[PDB]
Amino acid sequence: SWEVGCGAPVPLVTCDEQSPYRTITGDCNNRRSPALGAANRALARWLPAEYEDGLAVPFGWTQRKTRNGFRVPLAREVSNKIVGYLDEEGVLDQNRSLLFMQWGQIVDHDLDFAPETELGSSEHSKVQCEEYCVQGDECFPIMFPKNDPKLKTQGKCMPFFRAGFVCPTPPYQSLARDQINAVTSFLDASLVYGSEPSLASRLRNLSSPLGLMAVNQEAWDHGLAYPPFNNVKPSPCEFINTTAHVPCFQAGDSRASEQILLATVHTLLLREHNRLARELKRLNPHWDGEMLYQEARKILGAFIQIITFRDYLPIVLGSEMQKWIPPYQGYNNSVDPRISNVFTFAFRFGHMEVPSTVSRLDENYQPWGPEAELPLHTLFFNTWRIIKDGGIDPLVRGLLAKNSKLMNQNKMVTSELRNKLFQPTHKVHGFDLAAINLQRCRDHGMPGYNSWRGFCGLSQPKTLKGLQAVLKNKVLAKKLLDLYKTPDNIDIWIGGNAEPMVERGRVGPLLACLLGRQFQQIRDGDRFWWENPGVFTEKQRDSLQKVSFSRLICDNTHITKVPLHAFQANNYPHDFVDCSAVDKLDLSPWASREN
Ligand code: HEM
Ligand SMILES: *[C@@H]1O[C@H](CO)[C@@H](O[C@@H]2O[C@H](CO)[C@@H](O)[C@H](O)[C@H]2NC(C)=O)[C@H](O)[C@H]1NC(C)=O
Ligand SMILES: *[C@@H]1O[C@H](CO)[C@@H](O)[C@H](O)[C@H]1NC(C)=O
Ligand SMILES: *[C@@H]1O[C@H](CO)[C@@H](O)[C@H](O)[C@H]1NC(C)=O
Ligand SMILES: Nc1ccc(C(=O)n2ccnc2)cc1
Ligand SMILES: [Ca+2]
């Protein structure tokens, strides 16, 4: 009831009534409420935020302050006692490729980003949080538990800064704190093009009217494009090897270079766009740059939606797919297309799917070079291994023929992430992605596990044995009740991820509910969904149905043997076929001649 229209937004945004393209910012999608789904607004609250003080202070902020009559355990302790494991044998997913992991991260990055508010120019509390571990305002450091190895080697904390929040971006008053989504809620390739007109154009090739995306001129991949460098300094991709002096790449999403396989997939995504703007030229040489760009962008956005919705989600959601995501019925303007705050946690299930190492594979899909396989941690913010060691193709082969990690209740998150995560301002390959996830739940005012079980029409355990029966695991359940002392207090990230996988999928009931709703809402709520009548011609929509990730690979690399189904486990040379066995993206229906 308070501040019904609050915010310090992207202000002067008006709308074209019959514009055939999405805005960059995702604005003007919904007509009755054109800011719905747009970047740089609040994340949607499916449930009222729960803060220590009901307003903004995170649970665990204040010693003496309990949640339902109990102290919440330290995030790094939940990490250590529950999330970690030593043995990487037996952890691989026998029927999911490493690409399965990778698409997840892509899709996710297109949907949401809640950037930390550090927001200082020449600032003392930057290094002050890291150095001295002094909690305060936006500094909310992850403290070590007693007898934690990182005490011996790193200090007293890992640093952590609270997420951005709307309206008063510096202080706060009388409505609960709400974190920002810096990207568009729609599945619109915002990670290739940007979610700011400012970025969107700094990414374009405006030097020649072919509507191409700007490429790299310093370096090449057998005459294939690289994303341009991001010439901002301090660059972390330079920080990881000062000798190579190779910076991070520049993409529509800022996180592209966090790891080499993410960078890799961003590169396939750039080329597909350029490849598409070239073909449109040949068939429509009368069209200008802008339209070529837009029609390419339009084509790529559909491509991501099909792949995600036809190929990705059925094998994440499995049995719960149809329940939550009925086949398409058309655009409904009453659907909230906004990504919700809990989804930015639910989708972090992908964290448990990341394995310990990355391989590079030659044309016989054999260990490319002597150091073919590398540990994941040496590949954070590492572009130098792409430009100075083989291109994209060997890695794109790694994605096809190696396996995602399997989630496992006794082996959750690998140490490459749980202990050896590199973050940009800091220095050591020494952080804990699991600790962070949990600190973030609290920072974001997340309701606890039972609220969400409640929300999803599932039983709400109150006892050890109850939890045992739901998790189908005595020991896990025990360690959790020992830490959290009531399921009501269990952080949703751990809680949802602890539940056994549903038949034919890769998440448990609760997550499939959360994920399920969200994806349903983003498709049903999108005036520009590829299948929404009048978005494409029926002719255009029949060429669209035949895209594949395999074909994306074939059209954009020099790989000539691919699986038919890229997300399932594929073994070479058995499950591999020559590229010409594979449907293409016919673009005949896009030719629009003068008469
Ligand atoms: C090796 C691969 C990955 C690395 C190195 C990585 C790292 C990170 C980091 C550092 C964050 C920020 C956490 C925070 O500040 O609170 C994050 C957030 C996140 N991760 Fe990952 N991640 C990886 C893979 C994935 C995958 C495969 C998925 C999904 C399947 C995923 C889903 C998410 C989501 C949804 C967020 C929150 C984004 C937001 O809304 O701000 N991540 N990841
Ligand atoms: C930094 O990157 C450089 C490449 O620019 C790596 O140096 C190369 O190492 C391999 C291993 O034998 C050689 O094939 C090259 O001849 C080396 N080049 C140069 C210029 O030294 C180096 O290993 C990287 N170091 C780190 C710590 O990442
Ligand atoms: C823009 O396109 C022209 C014409 O194809 C090309 O020569 C040039 O390298 C491009 N510039 C950038 C920055 O991508
Ligand atoms: C792999 O994944 C899907 C998901 O159930 C399924 O259609 C297929 O049977 C599985 N393949 C194998 C070899 O188990
Ligand atoms: N799911 C991701 C979260 C964060 C990052 C990341 O830490 N940065 C840092 C700079 N750019 C991305 C990457 C992926
Ligand atoms: Ca988006």
UniProtKB/Swiss-Prot annotation:
Gene Ontology cellular component terms for the protein in this record: basolateral plasma membrane; cytoplasm; extracellular space
Biotechnology: The lactoperoxidase system is used by the dairy industry for the preservation of raw milk during transportation. Freshly obtained milk is supplemented with thiocyanate and hydrogen peroxide which are used by milk LPO to produce antimicrobial agents.
Binding sites annotated in the UniProt record for heme b: 108, 258, 351
Positions contributing to Ca(2+) binding: 110, 184, 186, 188, 190
Modified residues (3'-nitrotyrosine): 365
Catalytic reactions of this protein: 2 a phenolic donor + H2O2 = 2 a phenolic radical donor + 2 H2O; thiocyanate + H2O2 + H(+) = hypothiocyanous acid + H2O; iodide + H2O2 = hypoiodite + H2O
Keyword Nucleus applies: no
Keyword Disulfide bond part of the UniProt annotation: yes
Textual note on the cofactor: Binds 1 Ca(2+) ion per heterodimer.
Sites annotated Transition state stabilizer: 255
Cofactor dependency: Ca(2+); heme b
BP terms from Gene Ontology: antibacterial humoral response; antifungal humoral response; detection of chemical stimulus involved in sensory perception of bitter taste; hydrogen peroxide catabolic process; response to oxidative stress; thiocyanate catabolic process
Recorded GO MF terms: calcium ion binding; heme binding; lactoperoxidase activity; peroxidase activity; thiocyanate peroxidase activity
Notes on activation and inhibition: Inhibited by small molecule methimazole (MMZ).
Cystines in this chain: 6-167, 15-28, 129-139, 133-157, 237-248, 456-513, 554-579
Domain of life, per lineage: Eukaryota
Uppermost EC category: oxidoreductase
Principal cellular location given in the protein's record: secreted
In-chain residues carrying the UniProt-annotated modification Phosphoserine: 198
Annotated localization: Secreted; Cytoplasm
Described function: Heme-containing oxidoreductase which catalyzes the conversion of thiocyanate (SCN(-)) into antimicrobial agent hypothiocyanous acid (OSCN(-)) in the presence of hydrogen peroxide (H2O2). Also involved in the conversion of iodide (I(-)) into hypoiodite (IO(-)) in the presence of H2O2. Responsible for the inactivation of a wide range of micro-organisms and hence, important component of defense mechanism.
Family, per entry: Belongs to the peroxidase family. XPO subfamily.
Protein name: Lactoperoxidase
Organism: Capra hircus
Classification of source organism: Eukaryota, Metazoa, Chordata, Craniata, Vertebrata
